[PDB]
Design a binder for this molecule. Sequence first.
Ligand code: CL
Ligand code: CL
Lengths: 131, 131
Amino acid sequence: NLYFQGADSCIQFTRHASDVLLNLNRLRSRDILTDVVIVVSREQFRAHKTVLMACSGLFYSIFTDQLKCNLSVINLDPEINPEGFCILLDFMYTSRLNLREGNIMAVMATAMYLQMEHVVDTCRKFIKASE
Amino acid sequence: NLYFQGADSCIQFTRHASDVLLNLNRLRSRDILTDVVIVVSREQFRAHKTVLMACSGLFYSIFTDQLKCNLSVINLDPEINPEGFCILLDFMYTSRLNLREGNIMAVMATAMYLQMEHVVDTCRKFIKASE
Ligand SMILES: [Cl-]
Ligand SMILES: [Cl-]
């Protein structure tokens, strides 16, 4: 089946959470109900605020701030690597982190700035083994 | 670990999709960046439009319509069971469908109206066995 009897007294759907994520990424690709532009240097990234808050400590702190919550444009540190930000934004919407020899230092730096501890620790483990 | 080497050339996070969903539901509980009220009879339900679109064919068709996309209040058929709608909205944010003897006919009716085919079929399978 596509369902199971859960630990509690409830039916649970195995692929629902991943299907929601697939569909939110389809909304992103088509620029449907995106409500913010993240600007890193000269590059821009359109996204959904709630997805950003659900993945990053920094975006949650930003969009829970009463002054900043309704801003349509958010500028990040111009020192942040745009490729490293792109890889992380793609991870947020797909669960796949395209970690390579060339990008690993910039992805770790960006995830530290974005407060994405799971990705931060995973980068460290791959750096300790590649040494 | 919390990651695996995927089918493609990429690292994938096992719990990411479910963690995103847990966090979007925490945003809902706290009424953070909810952008629509769904009104069923006298009851109201606050939600995030993108979550609704990612789960229901009806909400996707509604919020992709240029006239209706920026509406903050959506009224459903006053004949729709509020309990049945509540169970489905909770499923959307949790993956758990609290299906009971008393609610199964109203949950199926509501999921048909909301174009949630996975839930519709699952209701039918439980009705064919309970007969
Ligand atoms: Cl079962
Ligand atoms: Cl691995």
